[PDB]
Each structure stands twice: as structure tokens, then as C-alpha cells.
Amino acid sequence: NLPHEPEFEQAYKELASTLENSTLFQKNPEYRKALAVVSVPERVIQFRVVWEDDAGNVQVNRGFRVQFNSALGPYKGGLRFHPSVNLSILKFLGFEQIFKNALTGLNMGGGKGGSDFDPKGKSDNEIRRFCVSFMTELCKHIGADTDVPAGDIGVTGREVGFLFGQYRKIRNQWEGVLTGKGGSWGGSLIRPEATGYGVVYYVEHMIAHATNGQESFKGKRVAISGSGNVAQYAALKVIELGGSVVSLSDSQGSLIINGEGSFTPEEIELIAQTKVERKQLASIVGAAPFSDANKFKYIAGARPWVHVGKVDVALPSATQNEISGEEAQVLINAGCKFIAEGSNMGCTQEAIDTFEAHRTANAGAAAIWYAPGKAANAGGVAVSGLEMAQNSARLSWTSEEVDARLKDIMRDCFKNGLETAQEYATPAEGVLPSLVTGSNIAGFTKVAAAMKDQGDWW
Amino acid sequence: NLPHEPEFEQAYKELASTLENSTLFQKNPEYRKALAVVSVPERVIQFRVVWEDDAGNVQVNRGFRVQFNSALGPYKGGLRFHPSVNLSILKFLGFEQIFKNALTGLNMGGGKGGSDFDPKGKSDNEIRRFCVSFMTELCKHIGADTDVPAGDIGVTGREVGFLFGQYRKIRNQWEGVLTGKGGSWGGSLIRPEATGYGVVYYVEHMIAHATNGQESFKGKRVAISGSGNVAQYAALKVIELGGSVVSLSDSQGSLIINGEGSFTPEEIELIAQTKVERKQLASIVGAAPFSDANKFKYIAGARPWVHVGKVDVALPSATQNEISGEEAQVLINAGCKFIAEGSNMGCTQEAIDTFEAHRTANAGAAAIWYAPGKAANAGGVAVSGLEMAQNSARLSWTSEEVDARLKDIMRDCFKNGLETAQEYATPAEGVLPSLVTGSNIAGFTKVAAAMKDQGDWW
Amino acid sequence: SNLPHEPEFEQAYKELASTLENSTLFQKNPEYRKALAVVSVPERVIQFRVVWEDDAGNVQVNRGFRVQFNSALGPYKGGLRFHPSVNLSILKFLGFEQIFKNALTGLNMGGGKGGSDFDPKGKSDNEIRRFCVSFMTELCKHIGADTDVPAGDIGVTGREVGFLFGQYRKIRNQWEGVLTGKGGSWGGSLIRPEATGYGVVYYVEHMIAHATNGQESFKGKRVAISGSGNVAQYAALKVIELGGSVVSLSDSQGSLIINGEGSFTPEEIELIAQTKVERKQLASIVGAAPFSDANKFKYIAGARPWVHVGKVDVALPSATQNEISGEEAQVLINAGCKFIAEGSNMGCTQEAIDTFEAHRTANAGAAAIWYAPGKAANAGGVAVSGLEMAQNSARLSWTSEEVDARLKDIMRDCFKNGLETAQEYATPAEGVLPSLVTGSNIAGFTKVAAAMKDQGDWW
Amino acid sequence: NLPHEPEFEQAYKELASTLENSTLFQKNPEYRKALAVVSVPERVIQFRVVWEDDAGNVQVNRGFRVQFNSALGPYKGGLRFHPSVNLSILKFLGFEQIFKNALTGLNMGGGKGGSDFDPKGKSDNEIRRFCVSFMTELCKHIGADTDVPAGDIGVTGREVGFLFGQYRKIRNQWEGVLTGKGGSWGGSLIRPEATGYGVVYYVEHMIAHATNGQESFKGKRVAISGSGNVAQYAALKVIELGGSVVSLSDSQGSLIINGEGSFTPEEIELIAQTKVERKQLASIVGAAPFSDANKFKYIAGARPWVHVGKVDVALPSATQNEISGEEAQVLINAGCKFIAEGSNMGCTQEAIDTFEAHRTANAGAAAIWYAPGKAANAGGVAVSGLEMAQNSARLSWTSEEVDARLKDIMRDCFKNGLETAQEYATPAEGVLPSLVTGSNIAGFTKVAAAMKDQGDWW
Ligand SMILES: O=C(O)CCC(=O)C(=O)O
Ligand SMILES: O=C(O)CCC(=O)C(=O)O
Does the annotation list A279 as a binding residue? Predict the structure, then answer.
């Protein structure tokens, strides 16, 4: 009699459902056995973590590493320190990580870990001691050839460092055992740029396919929402490829271009400085360059979608549910043909459904083409693979090298979606395949066939 | 945020209760910290087990090893294969194992493991393939100085053989990694006898103490339940000591003696053979000697306790929760003055409360005296420690040497419980000390103190 | 080379070497001169940084050391010392001696010594825990039940051994005999507290028997002891149990003497033990019974007991190193003392040792004072550590009587080996007592050097 | 108390003094804690080395490995066999190695080891046996992910081969555990070239910065001293980049170009053959091509500095203390703007002082710019990292690939010095940053911040 694990059960049921609404099990019914094998994790470690607080008292938390699947590579996935953490949640997140990592084409398996340790209110001294204790036990079960964790909620650069330092001390090895490391001790260039550059490259690959290699970002008008790092670097990449960035935004309003034109790199760097100083877009229109009313128009309380006029590409990069069903319709009437999520779950289900029905109802490049976040914002995962690659040679690559490689990985990510959809949700003649359906299946099918090849099931 | 683990949480709450109801936390209030720490397992491993059935189909089950505590020694405790198995249950069994193992005097930590694999209806080949697969993963986490498992429900000598065989092949070490091994490949004499002998030995000390050296098993009437190896060898040792054995039973009914007789060794040998053949007591009453209705009465559907009439000692040795509140009172009315669990968790908390209430109410030899399983049925795990001792010595001791050490262990276990109750749960004059409270405190403090010494808490 | 100056170690090497030269050993086996040169260089030395957090939350740095000197006879064995004086030279000195002390027990134990310059003085239990955790995080790599088995020494008692054991078992994930001096319920040995003290006395029993042709024992002898910790206590109680009289104890502040005939009783030693548990002085118990009975007890502040004991038959220095000067050696000689053995490690100064030895070689029969070296006479401690390792591998706890029995046999064999080896290689003049110093040094060295040769460490 | 370690204490004091004469401890006083922690080695192994001489006699020597710091990478640094070897000396060298290695921007820590073994007058056989015995112990402590030694005085190709053979045998792994290996068994192309080429690339980066990327080696006149591997390859690189090499020299004299012109690659090759035959430059001037007195002038007993006329770059690449105070002033007067040490400690302190005062007194490209050897001759170390990178993939890069990558590493070495001087020894407006000060501080700052991130100090 199995324990109640609602978050994991939900995630399994969603996969099994998306697999069922496809021809996968008509063509390959034996993959139902794969579904059953894959959803029992290969290994789970749980361990007590004892650590000393600043008053000198004994404290107790619970440590976790779910090593869910390793058919395609060593276990890969983040560590989460948050009071809500438990096996059920970490299984949900680790299970999903299998298939998102699989989607990229990198040799990365699937895992998730962490603790119910709550870093809110903790001194750095406390976080250090917790991390030291935590890694003392975890060290046994991980390694560059076995399991390579990373950060998540509660585990950023600071914690990764403390974790790395203690691993090194116990194991007496310097290796790529974590990703998200500092620039001087095995971190990668292009790490801040990864997500934003990643979305723009994915969309480039979409355009290329949709137009049979005749169009790129060159000459295209691109609406971006957000003004954090993802939006800034997506904007910079667009510009670098010859596109026009016509909008940026924050939670209070949108800053948009009047008529023809684009934001410039300099302007983007000014918006970055204002973002570092916690200031809102509303406050920078007072001075130049943004006080020029012939180039720039600030719109209070608005998202950009209905205000940019005619537009070719939309790149939501702010927050979740920032494209309504209604806004999807306007982008469609604005002639938008490509949309990809920079923000996690940026499109509402109504918007996704809209873009998909439009796709189904319109042959070729007359359709709007939506890419889901698990595919289009896999840049951060992509650069993690490159950080590992780089670590194996104790050698850093140039910005240009990491960038070029990030581009190729997003192509693999794209193609896995495209081809899976073509095979298992085959569209009508001249209709673009669904990247949402393709991306939801493709991880499972790559992992399942790998598992079969390796005798994990038969 | 934690998962609901009721079997485990109840055992914890109940131990905490017996510790509160004593002077232990008055004289050492710090030990409450130890309680919070010890209750979180050092390490838990869970893992997928894929195995092939006789049709050649893939089958999936879940593997577990709870390494609960190692302050006194390497993790020690059985493997259970039963479809009820899960983490909560093994946490429950593993927690109890800590304190049982502690009480043997031997350097043995507490652990428990197994699988939801059901051996019912499986071929021997299927069981072999399952054990090969199970041990392939488990081998990484165990070892002669790390974790030493053994049998339990679903895991007999047969399974231990398959498990050992696989370990030796992958680890390339021949060592005391398991106990309950076969005689020619590192098994110990007296291991089959140990639990049953051990409870009888323990109870002999109870009789001695409660009667001020007046009495022994000589002339006592002893009601036993069950008919597996515990009940058998308990029966045989009672007979050796001059007691009468007046009942045995299985899951279908009770075989009782009429009048003032007793089972014989020869009759016990016959019941043992009927049990190897997985037959029932109801199948053997229709032929001699058990068809003799002057001596024997078979009672279908019944536990033996009402049907034995007046008895002096009760040795439940069948199954968990086989003595209820009602039956505790039946045994009190029968003139029963000693009860000790041969089986794991034989008495309900209601029966325990009933017995303890009776002890408190009735000074001296009038009291029914109850010994907890962690003390009284420690004989088995004790002889496992001796199997480990023998493997490390690279010798096989005679039956007489193993048996001698088992007697010293059960003696010291009784003395410790008795003296610890005298110190921290001091009874009124003439009142028997609580073996429940004394055994719990003794076991707990030995672990907690060792944990403090080793810096696990402070 | 330009080797670093390591005076403590270099001095011990030369003294050892000299005692070997004053024998037939290198005449009979000149090739052992190469053995000696090879044995003098440690097999392995590990040094390491130990970073640890104080109670104020500040980072602190100390240096950690393990000298794995020799392993021909067994895994490296020897204690850990936390004391501000600790460095490589000092640990090499103590590790070198440990080789030969361990060899004389007859058990399979090699020779090692380690520790840190961490100063436990003034540190909280918590600080001590944090230091041990961090220290063992690095040391774990280099030690093990079949590799190197440390123990306590100055600055490392049961408390530290516990924190050190706990951290090892956590990182290594093996429960094993990696340390000795462990606690009773987690693989310690009975008799370990008594070992060193009982051991000296057992050894001296054989000295007395040999010197007097079995005509005397401890019965009726007056015994002066210095110190008031475990060694002094259990030595005293064993002497009392053998029918001798203990006429002094002492601590770093003064000595507490018996006046006239008479002895400390076990009850008095028990009280003294309780006060030394409380970290009090012998000073601050004299004004309270029974130690205020100024007919039986005299206290002298600032003094060692040797000049105040009157006539004495046996002396058992059991406080600290270098606690019998050459002058005090003469005082004991003139007091009529005939038997001396060290309860404290390096109790006698070299000057005292040269005096006892001069006096032995100048006097026939039992008119001579007989000095036993520490490597023979206080091996009781490390012997029972060896027994602890044996118990751990047996996965059993022996009884008091069994550990004690074996301790007795070990000390007896150790005495015999020193005696007979001196008779063979450093034969005394007719009627002179065999030198247990030369005897023990030769016996220890040759056991190691011959085993090294069998194992191809030299040829 | 502590042992007397004079060479190490000196090296420690010089670092502490450099760090005090900067703004580092004003801006970041907590880095004093870093200095105290970093100056205690992480680990030191000493060991007895017993080996057999050619007469069959036992010999005894002392082996050492100082594993000083691993924050930025596995321990890296050479092995020295010389009768002066001891812990103090090896700590001195390993301490310096941390910060030099750090300076390259490669993921390499800092270490040094060796023995007091004297190879003077030993047979190849004796050297083989010593190495076998030495590596038998050392193997335990090192490894491709832990510690990667190399050569030094007493340890060249021959010894590296013997050491690697024995490691392979015992460890049964083929990996990059040593650098300086033979071409066919893991050595890198560009290895003989590395130091010489490395010096020239470093100067290229200096030229680019000083001139706004307006100038290069193209059209420059370059005075080089020495005529061994470093001068030869430095020369060849200069010629490849369009520069003129106007001198070379040996201990007895200088061979310089008469008027404008340059040595050619064919001429460099001739000088290389003569140097292999162990002939001095004085004796190659009696034949063609060097007898042509219109092109070549031999100056007996002179260094080249005062005899080359106007020159843009100076590359002392012969020995130590080969540019006097006077010669530094002559070079300044000859229009020399770039000076960098091919040879270890080639510039006297008077010369370094003179170049630094000139820099201070002369805004921008008017200055002569001195690069210290720890930065400019770090190419040997750079190619070591590339050898490690190539060993990971069991794959040799092309000469062009190794060479291009060496150039980049020398840019990182440059940037680390430049930027560090900018921050902590900030020059007046328009004045070049001190590469000597920058290079002496930059390694420490990189290591200290990585140490802090990793919880080594806090
Ligand atoms: O011998 C063993 O280790 C298994 C015994 C056990 O699990 C028990 O005491 O219930
Ligand atoms: O118990 C041990 O291992 C030896 C302690 C020690 O170093 C000694 O004999 O002084």
C-alpha cells in the first residue's frame, strides 16, 4: 500500500494523458510498460541532517535526493531548500526534469533534491553549516559521472559554493559535481544570458523551418514583455540578429516604440541599470533618451501586446499568465506568427488553446506558432550541460563558443519537438506540427527507447 | 509538511510516553533532544526493482532499506517481502529494532528493509531472479561493517542464500553481510532455536525474581500460540525445563491439550514437518497421535487462551496483535503470572495497559508480569550478532558455546530492564518493576548516551 | 640534505643507537645498521590544515599531523595529542618510541603518533566538538581498522575520541575499530582505564621475583608513587591488593605523603579520584578528614615526593614526563629503593636513567637499583588498546577477568623478552642484573628490523 | 612551536607586503583572514623512498608532495629531484605556484613535490628504480581529478615517463595524471614552443591595449637575448606576426642584425642546430649565411641591448639578471615600449624599478611597459592545462588549435594583471596599470574569493 503523493500522482497522470491523446500507444503499445517502469525512480536517498545554529543549538532537518532516471545521462536536476519540501514534491519535480532534460538532446538524466531546511531568517553562518552537514552525507551518492545537482528555490550561488567546497574537502577531487558555479571555479560564461538567448535561438529555428530557411529575425518586429535579465538578453540577441525590439515592460506598465524603430543596446543597458536600482520603467521617461516622445511611449498599467501594432514575434518574458486568451487573439490580428515563452508558464491555457486552434486551422506560415516553455526556455539547462562539458577539460570556453553551442542545443530541442509531433500527432497536409504536443511526448519517447536499448524494460 | 506514517508515529509517541512516565527527563532533561534526533532515520534508501517472471515479462516492485541508527554498531535488521511493505511500516519496524538490538549488549545498530514483492504464488526461479535483482542495488549500501541484514516475513533461508550469492559475486568479498546463513556457508548453530529459546530463558529470570527464587519452569503450564520455528523451540525448551506445553496454533485454529498433559518433542517434530509442507493443524487431527481426543482438542477459528483453562505462563508466538484487552483479562483469570512475546508486537497496547495496570494494583507474585518484545524476543537478533562474531573469527562454535552466550545475553537483558525500572520507574514496595518501562529506558539511554559521545546531538 | 633540525627525534635516535652499539648485536649482525637507518625515516607523514569555527562565529586555523612511522608488525598504532607545543619533530620522537613499545607487547601493532597544535585549554565543549569534526574530516582518508588505529593522549580523552569516532563513522560509513579508548557501549574495552597502572605493577612483580630468586614480592614493600590521575590511582590500588604500602601521591602543586609505617587505603584513593574528577587540588582536601589526620598524612606544597618519603623499596613515577632528575635518582638510591618503573610516559630524565644504570652495573645481586624503561613497563595501556582492537574484530566484549588475564601474560612476556635479550646480547657481569633498558631496546628493535627484512623493506 | 622554514617565510612576507601596499585591505580587510588560511597548506605528504642501486645496495631518500591549494582546480605543479629538497623549499615553490597558476585563469590549484634524490651520476637504471619506488607511494595521493604533477629540476621527460609507467601499472588507469608527457602517450603539440610563443602573445595583448588596437607586432623591431628554446620560439612567433627580430645572444656574445632587417626562420633553424651541437655563436660567423657582414654583426662579450639601436620590444630570454639598471635606461632611450621576461627573473630589480618609474612618469603609450615573468612566461603552464584538456578526450589537438588556445590563455593572464592593478593599485588618469603589481595581487584575490565562496574561510 503506497503513500499518498498528490503532486507526483498529478504529474504522472498528466504525462499518461498526453501519451494517450496521440498515436504513440497505437504504433508502440509496448511503451505502456516503459511508462510503468520509468515512473518508479531508480533510487531515492533520504537522510537526517543535523546542523548547529548561531546560539549553539542542535537542529534537525531532512535531506533528499531523488535519482529518477539515468538512461540518457547521469542524474541532473536542482536542489531546493524550502519548508514545504518532501518526497512527493521532489518526485514531481524530478520526474518532470527527466523529460525536460531529455528534450534538449544532452546526455542528462533526471533528478531532484534538497531539504525542508528554511533559509528565510538564517544567518550566512547558519546556511554554511547547514550546507556543510547536508553535503557530508550527499557526497556519497553523487559525482561528475553519477549525479550532478544544481540550485533551485533556496539554493543559489552562495549555497552552491558552500556545497561545492565541502564536496571537494571530503572527496578530495575537483570536478563538475554541481552546475551554477562561480566564474573563477568552473562556472560558465553565457550563464546570465542563457534563458533569453535560448528563447531567441529557439524561435530562430522555428522561423527557419516555417519559411524553409528564407527568413530569420532580420527585419522582424518583436514584442517583448518584462525587463529583467531574460527580457534584456532576449532583446539584445534579437537586435544582434537584425530584429527590431518594439516593447519592454514591468509589472506597472509597458515602454513601447512609436512606429518603425527599435530599442538599442545602449537603451537596454540603461534599463538594466534602472532595474539594478529597483526603479520602475515609469520613472525613466522623465529624462533622455526615453523622454523622446517620437521614439518612445510609456503606457501605464498595460501589457504591450495590444499597443505594439503590427508585430511578427511575441516573447513573453515577465511572469506567469501574462498572455490572456484575448491577448492571443490580438497578437493573431496583429499578424504575429511566432510566440515562445521566456517566462515560466507565461501563456494562459486559453492563449495556448487559441494559438493551437489557429495553427490547426491555417496552413503553413499563415499560422501562428506557439512554443511551450519546457522547450523554448531550456537555455539555462542547455548552459548547465556546457558547464559540465567545460569542467571535464578544466578549461573555460569563450563567450562566442558557449553562445554558438547554446544555439545548436536549442536546435536539438526544437527538432525533438517537431519530429515527435510529426510522428505521433501527425498534422494535416501543410499544417505546422504542434510543438506543445511534440515537446510533451518527445522526452518520454527518447527515454523509453533508451531504456529499452539498455534492458531496463523489455 | 511531512507524510502520514501512523504505525511509526504511534510507536514513537508510545515510547516517548513511557520515558515521560519516569524520572529519566527529571535527572536528564537534555535526553528530550536525543529523542527528536534519534526519531529521524540516519539514512533511507529506496529503489526500483525490475525482475523477469516465468512468462518472460517485465515486473516492477519497490525496494527499501531504512538505516535508522548506528551509534552502537552497524545497522542490523531483517528484510521483509510482503505486498503491505512501505516506508512507514519499515520505519516502524526499524525504530523498534534500534532498542531491541541495543538491549542485546552487542554492537548492533538498528535497521530494516525489504520490498512490496509478494512471494505468494511465485516459483522458486521467480524468487531467485527477484533476489538477484534486489541485491544488485542493495549491495552498494550494505556490508559486514556497514549494514548486516537478515530474514523476516517473505525472506527465509532460501532467499538469504540467493541474496548472499549475488552479493558475493558483485562485491567480490565473502563476508558476514547477512545472518541466517546456511551451516556450510557461514551460518551459526542455535540461530533457528534462538528466538524461542531466548524468550523461555528471559521468562525463567522473571519467574525466579517474582517468586524470590522459589520456582522455575518446573511444573508450570505454558500456553503457546503459533507453530512456526519460534513456538516450536519455545515449546521444546519449556519441555526440557520440566514445564508443560498445553497449546499451539496456526492461522486457522488452536490445538490444545485436555487435562494435565503436555505436547511431547515427538509431537512437536510432527507439527514441524507438517509446517515445512505448508499444511495446517486441522489437516493432522484426523490421524494419530493427534486424533486421540483424550489428549487433544482442535478448535477451529480460535486463539488458544480461553481453551487452555488455568495456566501459569503465556508465550504468544504466532503473529502481531494476537492478544487483545479481552484476552489479557482471560489470562489474568486463568492465574497466568508471566507473559512474554515470542512473536513481534504480539500484544495490543490494550493488553499491555491491562497487564501494567494489574502489576501496579497487585503487589508481589499475585501480579501478571509482562515483558516487552524488545527485551524478551531479542534472542534471535542476539544469535545473529553471534553469527557475525563467528564469521569475523572464521570459526563455527559448537551449539553449547552459542547457547551459553545466548543465556548470558538474555540474563543481562533482563537484569538491565529490571534495574533500570528500579532506578527510574521505582515501584512501590513489593510491586514488580515494569519491564516495559525499564527496557524502554535502558535501550533508549544506551543509544542516546552513545549518540552524545559521538557528537550526533549535544 | 638540508634536513630540518628535529632535536627531540634526533636525540631519541642517538640514544637508541648508542644502546644498540653497547651490545653484541651489530657484531653478530652488522647488516642491522642498515635496518636502523631505514627504520628512522617514517613510512608516511600526513600534515594538513584544520579550519574550525569558534563560539563567536570566527574562523580559526590549526595544523594537523599523522606520523605513520612503521607498519612491519601491524597497522600503525598510537595516540593523538592536542597541545600548543605539537609539531612534526615532537610527533616523530613519540612515534619512533611507539614503534618499539608496541613491538614489545607481542601484538600485531605498528608505530604511529599524531595530533594538532590546537590548544584545548579554555575551549568550550562545542568548540572541541567542532575541532574534532573538522580534524577527522581530513584524517579519515589516511586511517582505518586495518591501516592506522589512533587513540587519546594529552588533550584527547574519551570526549575527543567520541567526537572523532562519530565523524569517522558518518563519512566512512563503516562501524569499526578505528580508534581505541572508546566508550563501553560503543566498542570500548573493560580494564582500559586500569591498564597502564596495573601493567607497571605487574611488570615490577616480575622484576622483584627475578632479583630476589622468588623470595620477595610486593608484600610488605613501601612504594612511592607520584601523580594522582588514572595511572597513579590504579597502580596504587594494585600494589595495595598485592600487600604493599603506597606512601605518596602527588599532583602539579604538591605531594601528599604517609608518615611512618602505613599506607593509603582504597577508600582514600577513591576520595582522591573524586576530587581529581572535580579538577580540584590535593592542596584543597587536606583540611577535611581523613586527610587532616596529621598523624597519618603530611602535605608539602611545591614538591615531588621523592625526598619526603623516607626509606622506600619501589618507586613508580606516574605523573608527568621528566619528573625524576639525576639528583632525585641519587636520593632514591640512598633511600634504599631497588625497583623503578615509569607509570608516566618518559617519567625519568636521561640523567636519572644513566644514574640507575651506572648503579646497576656497579653493584652485584639485589643491592642494585633496577630501572625498567617505559617502552617495556608502561605498555599495559597500548597492550589493552590492542585488546580493544581484538574485541572489536571479534564483535564481542570480553569480561574484566579476561582482558586482565591477557594484560598479565603480555607484561610477563615483555619482561621475559627484555631480560633474556639482554642476557643474550648485553650479558651482564656475574651477579649483575641484566639491563632491561638495553634488553628491551634490542628486543623491540630486532623484532621490527627482522620483520622489515622478511617483508623486503631493506635487504 | 613552528619549524624554521626560511624560504617559505620569505615568500609569505613578500606576498603580505605586496598586499599591504595596495588598496586591497582597505576595500576588503576581511581578506587578511584569507591570507592566514591560504598560507597553511591544505595537505602535505612526506614518505620514505627505498630503492636499489646498481651494486644491489639499499638506498633511502625522502619523498614529498605539498598539496597547497585546490580552490580553483586540482593541485598542479612540478616535481624536483635535487639534494637540497626539503619541505620549506617545496612550500616556497608550491605557495608561488598557487598564485601563478591562478593568474592564467585555468582551473588549476597549487602544489609542488619531489625528493632529495640526486640524479647526478645515477644510471638510467637507477633513475628508473627510484621513480618506480617514488610513484609506488605517491600514486595514492594524486590523480587526474586530484593532483597533476609535472617536471622541474631533476625531473624531465625521462623521469615523467618512468613515473607515468608506474602509475599506469599500479592504478590500472590511463589518464592525465602528469603533464610534460611524450607526444605519442598524451603529450601536447606546442609544448617545446609554449614559453617562447606565450611571451610573444602576452606582449601582443599589451601592445593592443596600449595603442587602442591600432598597433601589433607588425613592423616592430624586437631585441631578444639567449638562443635556446625560448629565444628561438619567441623569435619565430615574432616573425610569423610580421615583426623583425634584430638580435639573439649567448653567454659569450650577441649576434645582431646590421641596419634594418630580421632573422629568418631558416636562420633560426641553423642557430638551433648549432645549439644542439653545443657550439657558441662566435663560431658560426665564419660561414654563410652568418658571415655576410652586411646583414650580421657579432659583438664579442656583449648583451644586445645597447647595440641594436632603436627597438620597440625587448624580450630577455637567456638567464637571470641579464638587464641591468643601465641597460633598462638605454632601452628607454632607444624607444623601447614593451619589455617582458622570457627568462625567469631576467630583469634585475634596478631595471624593474626603472621601467616602473618611467611608466609612472609617462601617460599612455609614451610609457615603457614591463611584464613580469610570472605572467609573461606562463605559457608552459598554459600548455600544461591544454595537455590536461586533450587527455580528457584521449585526443590530440592540431598545432594550430593548441597555439590559438595558448594565445587566449595569455590574454586571460594579461587581463587578470591589468584589471587587478586598475582596482587595487589604481594609476593616475592616462597612466598604464602596473602589470608587476597587478600580477602579484591578482592570483591571491582570485583564490581568496573562491575560497570564501567555497566556505574555506568566512
Ligand atoms: O537477525 C536479524 O537481524 C533479524 C531479526 C529481526 O528483524 C527481529 O529481531 O525482528
Ligand atoms: O592507546 C594507544 O594507542 C597508545 C597510547 C599511546 O600513544 C601511549 O602508549 O602513550
Answer: no
